[PDB]
């Protein structure tokens, strides 16, 4: 016939945002623990009654690695560590703004060192006034591929601000199957996010009986264990989804390939215990379709450090010397970090290191399902109307 | 009422003939009329921060569409014709198919092109009104 | 204006035609222009989401008389005539007693019925105005 | 936008014309789209009264503009001639220099009669309307 140009207000359309997203946690306000302080100073009480409006019909092309929310947790948990362990001497580089011998000389910070308390406390980042929050809701969602039970929320669910390194602690399991995650396979650079279906659990303690502070002119030792029968179930379906990416190669785990103390051991902390756990009793075996361990308590032997290297930027620490005794830490394991070692002279072979330490990648695996965007109400469209003039 | 205070001419996902043709079956029928805890307060501001921005931000844009001869109307209607470099498409398969999320990327280019036609459409027939003032 | 937010045309009691033109008089004047407790907080919210839902039912009822030509005008006109069978009264009746509380128990057998006949009107106005876009 | 929720028109200050052309241009632009404390509540609340208070203000006057027949239009247009005792002074002077808040106080003295004159032109158009509908 003869086609109109129209404008209509109020359509559905979704854009990217880029803003700020205020906390969510349940604090006490109370007790000296050191999460409660900073919630109670910069964080809500949690939404009551939240509401989920499950969308129709649609698709939303939900990209994980270019997520810019999680860019913005990692400034967050930042900002709570310079407000929770101060270091008794933090040792940063400072570089002078001259062409090349550059200038940088490190500025070192003395400050008073009180052993405090510490535990994490779920939180939950919702959208400020007038954008919304979009779900996925499959239980495989594949990572940056679009899925298509959206739905839409304004507060995520619970999320513990736990920093560590090889295996991802205390969270959220998987729906139904232990998915695997990456930004893009074969390229042996991109961390291999793996997510479990069921929490295998940890126990780290070191009771008293070791107050042999030196040995010549132990307190820095400690322990954990995993439960044997229940940690291979788990294993046995990594090497399940892994195998279907590569059915012709081996299987074959190893232990780090070397680097910093941070990253080739596990590292976790309870109450400024950081644990520096050694695990290669835990990713010697080699694969295939059978087992290759034996045949209960893997003796994962741990140790207390002081001179740390920050994971908020480069930089030694140095804190206090350990509490006297009774440090206990009844954990989970969700996920697990796991690099790729390919190349030419990759025969047959699949070798999966333990990686980890960047922690926005540590919060990549707990904000994959969200995603913020705001609601553009313009909208354009060919008609058959006519404006009398 | 298509899931959030904004976007209430329909819900997502369905197309956009469906969306419109439902809204006045929803027009009809809305017409004719046929445990507590202390910290409610804060998550009470927060949903009421939500309610008064998209209000005040409803009244902004209305009052934003008299450059385009569009004051005060939800579904306006111009004289500017529809270019064919731009969809070419029918006007049935747009409204049958293509849902609003869709066709948004489809005209994408050119929603920065069309913007800046609709308001030399608006200065001219303003300047053929006053005119005709000359006579009447 | 008539003891609540909404109901603003005129307060209860008072006829039709005595209201309608009060309201005049409060148009032309307001136009010309011529101890605490922290439990206030609760109150405060519950006296702000009247005023807020006032609002926001206000403009949805607004926009939703545009299937009837009647958008964005709280006192409109159509061209539907006026049935005998419906009240079978004279207009200087109506107004001058007969208050808005007594009119709607009048007319609320077929208030159902004029709401129909007000839509298939418009769009035969609609229909009207396209006939003649094909001439102009 | 003008400092305040009302008086969005232009910032105060500036000239009438300088303002009114800045307008378009934020139009354009607007339409295109190219620590904490527990007693945060108390100053959420009093940030929203005057939120709700401006909104629930704006839609007042902007249905009590019908007596004018400028009714949902912040710029509207009469048909009452300019009288030359009133100002006495051109078109492009008043535009040009003279800011809002002097020329208020250039036309006080007249600002409550011009009321007058509005609503008396307002009730012949009404009527002259009204003898066409014997017609059409
Ligand atoms: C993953 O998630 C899990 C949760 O599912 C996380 O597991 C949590 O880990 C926490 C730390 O690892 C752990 O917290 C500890 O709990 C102890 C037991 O709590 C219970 O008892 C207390 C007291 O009876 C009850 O009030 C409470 O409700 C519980 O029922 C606490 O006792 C611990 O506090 C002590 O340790 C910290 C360590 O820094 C000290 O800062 C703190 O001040 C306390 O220190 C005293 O005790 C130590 C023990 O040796 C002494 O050495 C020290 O000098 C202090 O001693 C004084 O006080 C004692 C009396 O307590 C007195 O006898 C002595 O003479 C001195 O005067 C600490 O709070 C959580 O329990 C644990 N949760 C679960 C469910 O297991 C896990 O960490 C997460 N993963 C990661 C990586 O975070
Ligand atoms: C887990 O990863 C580690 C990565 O370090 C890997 O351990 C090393 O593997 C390499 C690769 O085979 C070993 O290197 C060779 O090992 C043979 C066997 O002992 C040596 O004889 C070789 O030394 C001779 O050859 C060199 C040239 O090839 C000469 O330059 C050299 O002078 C010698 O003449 C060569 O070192 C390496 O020994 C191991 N190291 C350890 C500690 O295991 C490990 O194999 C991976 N795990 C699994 C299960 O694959
Ligand atoms: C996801 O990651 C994958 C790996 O992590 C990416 O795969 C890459 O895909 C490209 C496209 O084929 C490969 O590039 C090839 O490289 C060879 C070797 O180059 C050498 O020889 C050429 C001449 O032959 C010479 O000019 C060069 O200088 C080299 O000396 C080329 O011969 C090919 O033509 C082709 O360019 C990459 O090798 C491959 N990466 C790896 C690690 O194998 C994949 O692209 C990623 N996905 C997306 C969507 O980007
Ligand atoms: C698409 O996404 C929606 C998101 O809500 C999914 O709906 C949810 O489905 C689960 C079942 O896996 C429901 O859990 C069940 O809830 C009922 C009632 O609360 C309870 O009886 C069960 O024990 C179980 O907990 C969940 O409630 C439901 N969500 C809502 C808001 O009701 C839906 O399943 C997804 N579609 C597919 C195909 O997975
Ligand atoms: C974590 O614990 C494992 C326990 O097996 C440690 O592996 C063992 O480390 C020692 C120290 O280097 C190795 O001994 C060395 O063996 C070579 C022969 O390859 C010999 O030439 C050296 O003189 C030295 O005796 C030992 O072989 C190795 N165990 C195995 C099975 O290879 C590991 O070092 C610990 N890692 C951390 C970071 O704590
Ligand atoms: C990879 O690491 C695992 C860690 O568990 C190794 O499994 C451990 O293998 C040793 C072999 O010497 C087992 O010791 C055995 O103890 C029994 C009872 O005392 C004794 O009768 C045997 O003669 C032997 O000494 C140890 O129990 C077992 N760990 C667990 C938790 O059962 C595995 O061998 C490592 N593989 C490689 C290739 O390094
Ligand atoms: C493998 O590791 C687990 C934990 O790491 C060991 O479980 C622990 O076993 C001891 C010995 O029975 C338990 O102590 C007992 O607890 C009961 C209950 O309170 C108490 O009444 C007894 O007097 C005694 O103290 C200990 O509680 C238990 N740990 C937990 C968390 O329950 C297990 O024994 C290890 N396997 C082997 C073969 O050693
Ligand atoms: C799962 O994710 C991968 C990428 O992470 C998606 O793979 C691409 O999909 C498009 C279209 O589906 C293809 O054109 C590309 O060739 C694929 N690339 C690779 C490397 O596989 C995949 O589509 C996602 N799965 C689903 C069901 O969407
Ligand atoms: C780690 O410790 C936890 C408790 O701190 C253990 O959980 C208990 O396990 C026993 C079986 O041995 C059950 O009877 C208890 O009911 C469990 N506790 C609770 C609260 O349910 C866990 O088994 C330990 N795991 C390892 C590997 O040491
Ligand atoms: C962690 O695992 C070690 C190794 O099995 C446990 O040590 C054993 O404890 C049981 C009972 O306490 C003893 O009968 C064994 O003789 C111990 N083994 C050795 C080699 O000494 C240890 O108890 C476990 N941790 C906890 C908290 O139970
Ligand atoms: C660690 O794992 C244990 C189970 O191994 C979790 O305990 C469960 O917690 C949920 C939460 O409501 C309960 O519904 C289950 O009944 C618990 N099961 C058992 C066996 O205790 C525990 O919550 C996990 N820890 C964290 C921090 O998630
Ligand atoms: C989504 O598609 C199904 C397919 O039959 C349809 O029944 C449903 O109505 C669609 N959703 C909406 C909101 O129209
Ligand atoms: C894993 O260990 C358990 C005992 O802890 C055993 O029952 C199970 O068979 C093992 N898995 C495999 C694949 O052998
Ligand atoms: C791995 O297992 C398969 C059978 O599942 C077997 O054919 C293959 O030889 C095994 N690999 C090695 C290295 O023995
Ligand atoms: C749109 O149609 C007009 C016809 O007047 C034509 O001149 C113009 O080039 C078309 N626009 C584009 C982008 O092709
Ligand atoms: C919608 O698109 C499909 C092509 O995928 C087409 O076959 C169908 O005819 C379209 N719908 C209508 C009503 O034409
Ligand atoms: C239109 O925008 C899309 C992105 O949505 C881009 O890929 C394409 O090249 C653009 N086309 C033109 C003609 O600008
Ligand atoms: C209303 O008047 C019309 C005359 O056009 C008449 O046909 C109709 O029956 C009347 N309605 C009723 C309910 O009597
Ligand atoms: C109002 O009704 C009464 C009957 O109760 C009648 O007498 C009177 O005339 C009516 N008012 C007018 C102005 O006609
Ligand atoms: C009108 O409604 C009233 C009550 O709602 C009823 O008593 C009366 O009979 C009805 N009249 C007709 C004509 O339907
Ligand atoms: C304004 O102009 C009119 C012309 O019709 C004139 O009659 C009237 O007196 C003027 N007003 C004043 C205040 O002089
Ligand atoms: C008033 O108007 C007359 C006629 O246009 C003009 O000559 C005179 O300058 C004006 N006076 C003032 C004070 O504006
Ligand atoms: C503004 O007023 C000055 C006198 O103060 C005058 O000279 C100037 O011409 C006026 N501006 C314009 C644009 O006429
Ligand atoms: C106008 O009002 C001002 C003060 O508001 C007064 O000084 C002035 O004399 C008045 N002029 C006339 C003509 O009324």
Known sequence: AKKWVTVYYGVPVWKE?????????????????????????????????????????????????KNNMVEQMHEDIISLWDQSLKPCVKLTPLCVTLNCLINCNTSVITQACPKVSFEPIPIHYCAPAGFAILKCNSKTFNGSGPCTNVSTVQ????????????????????????????????????????????????????????????????????????????????????????????????IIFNHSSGGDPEIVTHSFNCGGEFFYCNTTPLFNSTWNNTRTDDYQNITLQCRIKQIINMWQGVGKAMYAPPIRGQIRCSSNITGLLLTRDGGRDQNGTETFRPGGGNMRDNWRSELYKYKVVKIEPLGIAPTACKRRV | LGAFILGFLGAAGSTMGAASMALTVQARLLLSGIQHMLQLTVWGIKQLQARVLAVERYLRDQQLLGIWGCSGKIICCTNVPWNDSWSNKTINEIWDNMTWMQWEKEIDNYTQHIYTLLEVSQIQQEKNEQELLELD
């Not at chain 1, 009771?207 to 002119?217: F, L, V």
């Open chain 1, 155 to 250: 507060c995520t669910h619970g999320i513990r601000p736990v920093v560590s390194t090889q295996l991802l602690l205390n969270g959220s399991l998987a729906e139904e199957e232990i998915v695997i995650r990456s930004e893009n396979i074969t390229d042996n650079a991109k961390t291999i996010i793996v997510q479990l279906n069921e929490a295998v659990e940890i126990n780290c303690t070191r009771p008293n009986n070791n107050t042999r502070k030196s040995i010549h002119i132990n307190i820095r030792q400690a322990h954990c264990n995993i439960s044997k029968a229940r940690w291979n179930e788990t294993l046995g379906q990594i090497v399940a989804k892994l195998e279907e990416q590569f059915p012709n190669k081996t």
């Open chain 1, 17 to 65: 945002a880029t803003t700020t997203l205020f906390c969510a946690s349940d604090a006490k306000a109370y007790d000296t623990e050191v999460h409660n302080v900073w919630a109670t100073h910069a964080c809500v009480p949690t939404d009551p009654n939240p509401q989920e409006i499950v969308l129709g019909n649609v698709t939303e092309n939900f990209n994980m690695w």
